[PDB]
């Protein structure tokens, strides 16, 4: 199966 | 023997301020992976692979002005809730934290965010990456 990595980089 | 059936999961960091990123990796985050292992005699071996990598870290696409640079995701084994040894992609390791006395197993891992290239070249905005995880007992 899979593991997703996510987020939001902010300046 | 039959390999375990791994359930998909997501590790979400929410908002991450670029200025706070450590090149070596910080923003440590613990996460779990659930799986169904009909055959669970012996010890579990897990192997994690990814299509885009850099020196044993997952290289997140479209996160730097330079396409070959960018955000990095480093993975680590777990030792009783404490971060353990780094995981080498493509090689087997035995999870240090496994729960579930039945076929339903859950392992704990840790991940850190780092980056390749200059911090000033990092691109703000939503990012996403994926890795494949296989597991089986032996």
From Swiss-Prot, chain A:
Superkingdom in the source lineage: Bacteria
Location in the cell: Secreted; Fimbrium
General remark: Strains of E.coli that cause infection of the human urinary tract produce pap-pili which are hair-like appendages consisting of about 1000 helically arranged subunits of the protein PapA. These pili mediate binding to digalactoside-containing glycolipids present on the epithelial cells which line the urinary tract.
Function (record text): Adapter that links the pilus rod to the base of the tip fibrillum. Regulates the length of the tip fibrillum and joins it to the pilus rod. Pili are polar filaments radiating from the surface of the bacterium to a length of 0.5-1.5 micrometers and numbering 100-300 per cell, and enable bacteria to colonize the epithelium of specific host organs.
Protein name (database record): Fimbrial adapter PapK
First and last residues shown, out of full length: 22 to 32 of 178
From Swiss-Prot, chain B:
Task of the protein: Repeated PapE subunits make up the thin (2 nm in diameter) tip fibrillum of the P pilus. Subunits are arranged in a open helical conformation. Pili with a defective papE gene have low adhesive capacity or none; however, the binding property of the whole cell is not affected. Pili are polar filaments radiating from the surface of the bacterium to a length of 0.5-1.5 micrometers and numbering 100-300 per cell, and enable bacteria to colonize the epithelium of specific host organs.
Compartment(s) of residence: Secreted; Fimbrium
Assembly notes: Probably interacts with chaperone PapD. Assembly of the P pilus requires periplasmic chaperone PapD, in absence of the chaperone overexpression of this subunit is toxic, with PapE accumulating in the periplasm. Misfolded protein interacts with CpxP, which probably targets it for degradation.
Parent-protein residues present: 36 to 162 of 173
Keyword Iron: no
Primary residence: secreted
Domain of life: Bacteria
Gene Ontology biological process terms in this record: cell adhesion involved in single-species biofilm formation
Extra remark: Strains of E.coli that cause infection of the human urinary tract produce pap-pili (P pili) which are hair-like appendages consisting of about 1000 helically arranged subunits of the protein PapA. These pili mediate binding to digalactoside-containing glycolipids present on the epithelial cells which line the urinary tract.
Name the record gives this protein: Fimbrial protein PapE
Keywords: Cell adhesion, Fimbrium, Secreted, Signal
Post-translational modification: Overexpression of this protein in the absence of chaperone PapD leads to proteolysis of itself and CpxP; degradation requires both cpxP and degP, as well as the N-terminus of PapE.
Any one GO cellular component localisation term in the record: extracellular region
């Amino acid at each position: 199966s899979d593991v997703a990595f996510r987020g939001n980089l902010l300046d | 023997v039959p390999a375990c059936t791994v359930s998909n999961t997501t590790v979400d960091w929410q908002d991450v301020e670029i200025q706070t990123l450590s090149q070596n990796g910080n923003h440590e985050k613990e996460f779990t992976v659930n799986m169904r292992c009909p055959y669970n005699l012996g010890t579990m071996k897990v192997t994690i692979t990814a299509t885009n990598t850099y020196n044993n870290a997952i290289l997140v696409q479209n996160t730097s002005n330079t396409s070959s640079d960018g955000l990095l995701v480093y993975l680590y084994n777990s030792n009783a809730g404490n971060i353990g040894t780094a995981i080498t992609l493509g090689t087997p390791f035995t999870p240090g934290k496994i729960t579930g006395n039945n076929a339903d197993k859950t392992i704990s891992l840790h991940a850190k965010l780092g980056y390749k290239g200059n911090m000033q070249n990092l691109i703000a905005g939503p990012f996403s990456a994926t890795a494949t995880l296989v597991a089986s007992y032996s």
